[PDB]
Amino acid sequence: TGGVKKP
Amino acid sequence: EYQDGKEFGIGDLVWGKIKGFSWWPAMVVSWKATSKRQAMSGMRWVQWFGDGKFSEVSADKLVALGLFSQHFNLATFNKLVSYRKAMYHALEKARVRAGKTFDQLKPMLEWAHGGFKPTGIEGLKPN
């Protein structure tokens, strides 16, 4: 729910 | 950081485009905010309004949030509550910065779609 956004 | 001749600096409000999604509002951040790694030259780390996540994005896949009507996606806005939440937090931030007073989205959206008057895009700048 944090960190890097996944396309 | 980000001295590559390409556009955008830390604190800039932007629209960002990654594979699979509409243009989405974000803020340019330093790589240190991300606890990841330095961005490749030509790229920027952005943090997305709404979910607070980070992406490394090409400066050619970013436009100033100020160009609002040109990238606002009405279908996505109608289809997704996440997009509407994203719009609020991003416009809230836009408001505070520029000088703007005023479901509470409405006049923020209108102000945005209308070209951020009185201030214009100039009042979106970071400091």
Curated annotation (Swiss-Prot), chain B:
Localization, per the record, is: Nucleus
After translation, the protein is modified as follows:
Sumoylated. Citrullinated by PADI4.
Task: Provide the PWWP domain boundaries.
Answer: 10-68
Q: Tell me which tissues or organs this protein is expressed in.
A: Ubiquitous; highly expressed in fetal liver, heart, kidney, placenta, and at lower levels in spleen, colon, brain, liver, small intestine, lung, peripheral blood mononuclear cells, and skeletal muscle. Isoform 1 is expressed in all tissues except brain, skeletal muscle and PBMC, 3 is ubiquitous, 4 is expressed in all tissues except brain, skeletal muscle, lung and prostate and 5 is detectable only in testis and at very low level in brain and prostate.
Q: How does it assemble?
A: Interacts with BAZ2A/TIP5, SUV39H1 and CBX4. Interacts with UHRF1. Interacts with DNMT1 and DNMT3A, SETDB1, UBL1, UBE2I9 and ZHX1. Interacts with the PRC2/EED-EZH2 complex.
What pathology is it implicated in? Immunodeficiency-centromeric instability-facial anomalies syndrome 1: A rare disorder characterized by a variable immunodeficiency resulting in recurrent infections, facial anomalies, and branching of chromosomes 1, 9, and 16. Other variable symptoms include growth retardation, failure to thrive, and psychomotor retardation. Laboratory studies show limited hypomethylation of DNA in a small fraction of the genome in some, but not all, patients.
Record remark: domains? The PWWP domain is essential for targeting to pericentric heterochromatin.
**What is the purpose of this protein?**
Required for genome-wide de novo methylation and is essential for the establishment of DNA methylation patterns during development. DNA methylation is coordinated with methylation of histones. May preferentially methylates nucleosomal DNA within the nucleosome core region. May function as transcriptional co-repressor by associating with CBX4 and independently of DNA methylation. Seems to be involved in gene silencing.
Query: Per the similarity annotation, which family is this?
Result: Belongs to the class I-like SAM-binding methyltransferase superfamily. C5-methyltransferase family.
Q: What is this protein called?
A: DNA (cytosine-5)-methyltransferase 3B
Query: Origin organism of this chain?
Result: Homo sapiens (Human)
What is the taxonomic lineage of the source species?
Eukaryota, Metazoa, Chordata, Craniata, Vertebrata
Gene that encodes the chain: DNMT3B
Residue span relative to the full protein: 216 to 351 of 853
